Design a protein around this ligand. Structure first.
Ligand SMILES: Nc1ncnc2c1ncn2[C@@H]1O[C@H](COP(=O)(O)OC(=O)CCCC[C@@H]2CCSS2)[C@@H](O)[C@H]1O
Length: 331
């Protein structure tokens, strides 16, 4: 198991966008045939999933007011708020050695639950979706995707929360707790760097690993990471361009999550379409949106096109194609 701390010439980095960039850089460029761990503690910012639209997920005025960034990550899932009171861990798992991990939140979280138990946390449970919950209240969210031969997976930990701010800055569908007061009393006043440390030590134990193999980002890695920051994580086209607000917007709750269709209509046909939501598609939806372009907004064309798109190739659960058809027929 490798550990990549987000350090630059020995300085700890807290920029959420750079932190993802580090991870994705590793994913793409670090051919280590071992799990790499990426602990990260970020300055306040909102991180949204790849398929999400920041405009509908964030209170944009509160974000501007508080002068904090939106950062889109590469994985699906939903929008989280991240500050110095959260400790997150991403991973680059060799896909061949963890073939059953893709989409398997339970497996992914098993060592985490184990770590949290070991650390005195009451009754942390896998939510069954992609979360960890104590007595109804979410303490962690997770996301993953397959990229190259690597599974990119990450979970957050809400060590301490600003409950007021979190429910104000995130506008989903328009509840969570801290871990601080829930650890063994020995740990209850640990700072965030101490929790990260405690968690990583515990994570090694729970995973039967004596020590992390050391990987320090070199100047040269940083040049590539900085480039991915410029071209992607802090690139408007990626953060904002990716999810345009088209004229018509409809959403359905489905098993995979809330799917929103944002589309343009010219001559009774879908002219532009953007499918967004907090889900975890099997492959990129760009192909599906492209497939749907040109479809007449009639039952017959929509049903057929939606059938032909083989939605199961794109989403894990079954989507009601007719639900989507009928939703779109109303425009
Ligand atoms: N920092 C944070 N951590 C955990 N849960 C949060 C957080 N912020 C908000 N929430 C709550 O989760 C829901 C949205 O959860 P939802 O289930 O929609 O999706 C997620 O959680 C994505 C997890 C983040 C993936 C990153 C890849 C490695 S590190 S983390 C939001 O509305 C809040 O109620």
């Amino acid at each position: 198991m490798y550990l990549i701390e987000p350090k630059r010439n020995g300085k700890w980095v807290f920029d959420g966008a750079i932190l993802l960039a580090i991870q994705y850089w590793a994913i793409k460029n670090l051919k280590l045939d071992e799990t790499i761990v990426f602990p990260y503690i970020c300055d306040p910012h909102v991180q949204i999933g790849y398929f999400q639209n920041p405009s509908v997920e964030v209170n944009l005025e509160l974000l501007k007011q508080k002068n904090i960034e939106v950062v889109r990550r590469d994985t699906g899932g939903g929008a989280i708020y991240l500050d110095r009171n959260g400790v997150n861990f991403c991973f680059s798992f060799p896909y061949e050695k963890n073939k059953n991990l893709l989409g398997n939140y339970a497996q992914f979280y098993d060592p985490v639950i184990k770590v949290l138990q070991n650390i005195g946390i009451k009754n942390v449970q896998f939510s069954g979706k992609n979360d960890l919950q104590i007595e109804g209240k979410k303490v962690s969210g997770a996301a993953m995707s397959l990229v190259n031969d690597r599974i990119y997976a990450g979970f957050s930990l809400l060590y301490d929360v600003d409950f007021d701010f979190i429910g104000k800055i995130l506008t989903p569908n328009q509840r969570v707790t801290n871990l601080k007061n829930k650890l063994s009393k020995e740990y209850q006043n640990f700072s965030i760097f101490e929790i990260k440390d405690l968690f990583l030590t515990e994570f090694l134990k729970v995973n039967s690993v004596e020590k992390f193999k050391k990987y320090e980002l070199t100047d040269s890695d940083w040049v590539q990471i900085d480039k991915m920051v410029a071209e992607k994580y802090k690139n408007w086209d990626f953060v904002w361009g990716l999810s345009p607000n088209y004229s018509f917007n409809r959403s359905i709750r489905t098993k995979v999550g809330t799917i929103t269709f944002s589309l343009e209509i010219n001559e009774g046909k879908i002219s532009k379409i953007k499918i967004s939501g907090d889900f975890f598609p099997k492959k990129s939806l760009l192909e599906l949106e492209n497939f749907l372009m040109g479809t007449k907004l009639t039952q017959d064309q929509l049903l057929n096109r939606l059938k032909d798109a083989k939605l199961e190739d794109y989403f894990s659960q079954k989507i009601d194609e007719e639900e989507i058809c009928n939703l779109l027929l109303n425009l």
